Ligand binder design. Structure first.
Ligand SMILES: CCC(CC)NC(=O)Nc1cccnc1
Lengths: 237, 300
């Protein structure tokens, strides 16, 4: 059934699983037409498919051409997501295929279930967690590869950089969701925190800066402060 | 006109015959039902006074044999049986009539209710859903599960309705996943109508039989089957015009006949609201939508 606070440690056991987040698949800018009506212009998007144990991120990049001449794009986006994820599972060797796929939004359950009928033994699950994966396009290197794509493409990342050399996947996932929660609540502030010190850099093969353990604790404190702040600024407390 | 005699009525029971019924008393001198219209299937059904648990009954067609009821004190129920001695049968029936020991099937002449509920129902198809080939009539009761329910336990005592499952490889063509799930016409017309049922008459007959088992026995799996067969049509953008017209009539008479007090347990809110208001056929069931809105507007 659904994934929640009570069964949180299952994310880090040794059964292969993937999160799928579809919130950045269909992206638009809304603008006025010469006649003063409103229209949308699609921009490139991405499916965010993440192994929470290993950090392996399968970024399937959704080029605007896939929407040409289609109707009801928000509904099509869920099915295209399910179509791309099922193609990815087929692409992977049997022993790498997931035993569960957790979708971050319940409207992905039926599209994915239907695309995965060939895999009766892969559990398709919702979650009650409010995860912040929509903020993946606030990671500069991910946003850049999405916006530069001229055709469909799947780029592979480790969203944990080398953190697992020093910390467990539970701690790595907690750090990731704190960073992304901060970027979602106040992107400018969050990015200022991450980059204010020019001496700590992002390796070419990494997404986040090369913080020492001590520096991560400071960073993590700063991100909690930010989220608490915004929560007051927002609610006046 | 045909007759189903009773040997006796040793236990107090409410006896149904089609949409009619009446409470009979323990050892009250009851010897059956006469004047039963030829040309239709019929169902004779029972609810004991001392245990309103287990409604049960028999589907039959008088053209296929001489049938009677006899209480079995070991198995504790009224059993249908076939009398093969035709002379012996006519003699018994004539004596019981002479002694006016039979109630009369009380068909009002204006009334096409039973015809309209059983228009497409055929004994030969009932006997394939309810497997027991040594008898020409078919036993059904409240508790019998369907083959699909058994998948999700005694197979000899199951209702073998045609399995409908909207999230199944049979329903969904590889490569048309979204198309086939949002518009079920392929599954209705190619898979079910052309492939399994052969024609819409057989489809409507199974649907009508499932409704009647849901209504007369409270058979839950039959209710599930009735709604699935409605929903498959309503969820198809492409349905022959004659099938939509006939479905509207079929459903109209089903809703008309349903006991007002059972509408809470025999009608699935989600399916009906979807079918009348969101589906491809939301505007195609005028008679059914009018009677539903005037009779069960709470459900909607
Ligand atoms: C280009 C259209 C096809 C058919 C859906 N997509 C596809 O092969 N997607 C894919 C392939 C391999 C790994 N991940 C995703």
């Amino acid at each position: 059934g659904a994934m929640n606070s009570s069964n949180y440690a299952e994310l880090f056991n040794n059964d292969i699983k993937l999160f799928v987040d579809d919130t950045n698949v269909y992206r638009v800018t809304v603008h006025k037409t010469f006649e003063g009506n409103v229209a949308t212009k699609a921009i490139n998007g991405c499916i965010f498919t993440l192994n929470p144990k290993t950090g392996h991120l399968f970024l399937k990049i959704i080029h605007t051409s896939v929407w040409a001449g289609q109707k009801r794009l928000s509904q099509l986006a869920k099915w295209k997501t399910a179509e791309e994820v099922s193609a990815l599972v087929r692409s992977l060797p049997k022993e790498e295929q997931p035993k569960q796929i957790i979708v971050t939004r319940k409207a992905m359950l039926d599209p994915l279930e239907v695309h995965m009928l060939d895999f009766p033994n892969i559990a398709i699950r919702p979650t009650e967690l409010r995860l912040p994966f929509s903020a993946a396009m606030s990671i500069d290197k991910l946003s850049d590869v999405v916006m530069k794509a001229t055709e469909p493409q799947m780029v592979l990342f480790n969203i944990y950089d080398d953190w697992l050399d020093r910390i467990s996947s539970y701690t790595a996932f907690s750090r990731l969701t704190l960073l992304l929660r901060a970027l979602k609540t106040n992107e400018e502030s969050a990015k200022m925190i991450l980059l204010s010190d020019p001496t700590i850099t992002i390796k070419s093969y990494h997404l986040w800066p090369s913080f020492t353990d001590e520096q991560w604790i400071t960073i993590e404190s700063q991100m909690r402060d930010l989220i608490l702040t915004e929560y007051g600024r927002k609610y006046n407390v | 006109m045909n007759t189903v005699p009773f040997t006796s009525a040793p236990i107090e029971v409410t006896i149904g015959i089609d949409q009619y019924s009446f409470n009979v008393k323990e050892n009250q001198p009851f010897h059956g039902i006469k004047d039963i219209p030829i040309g239709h299937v019929h169902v004779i059904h029972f609810q004991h006074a001392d245990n309103s648990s287990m409604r049960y009954g028999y589907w039959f067609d008088c053209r296929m044999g001489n049938f009677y009821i006899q209480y079995d004190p070991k198995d504790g129920l009224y059993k249908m049986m076939e009398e093969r001695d035709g002379a012996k049968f006519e003699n018994i029936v004539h004596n019981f009539k002479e002694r006016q020991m039979m109630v009369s099937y009380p068909k009002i002449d204006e009334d096409d209710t039973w015809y309209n509920l059983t228009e497409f129902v055929q004994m030969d198809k009932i006997r394939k859903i309810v497997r027991k080939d040594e008898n020409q009539f078919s036993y059904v009761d409240s508790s019998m599960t369907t083959v699909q329910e058994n998948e999700l336990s005694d197979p000899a005592h199951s209702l073998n309705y045609t399995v409908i499952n909207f999230k199944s490889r049979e329903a969904i063509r590889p490569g048309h996943e979204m198309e086939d799930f949002l518009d079920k016409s392929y599954y209705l017309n190619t898979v079910m109508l052309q492939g399994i049922f052969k024609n819409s008459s057989n489809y409507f007959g199974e649907l009508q039989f499932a409704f009647l088992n849901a209504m007369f026995f409270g058979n839950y799996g039959s209710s599930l089957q009735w709604h699935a067969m409605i929903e498959l049509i309503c969820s198809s953008a492409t349905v022959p015009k004659h099938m939509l017209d006939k479905l509207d009539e079929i459903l109209y008479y089903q809703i008309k006949t349903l006991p007002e007090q059972y509408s809470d347990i025999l009608l699935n809110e989600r399916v009906w609201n979807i079918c009348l208001y969101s589906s491809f056929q939301k505007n195609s069931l005028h008679n059914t939508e009018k009677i539903m809105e005037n009779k069960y507007p709470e459900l909607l």
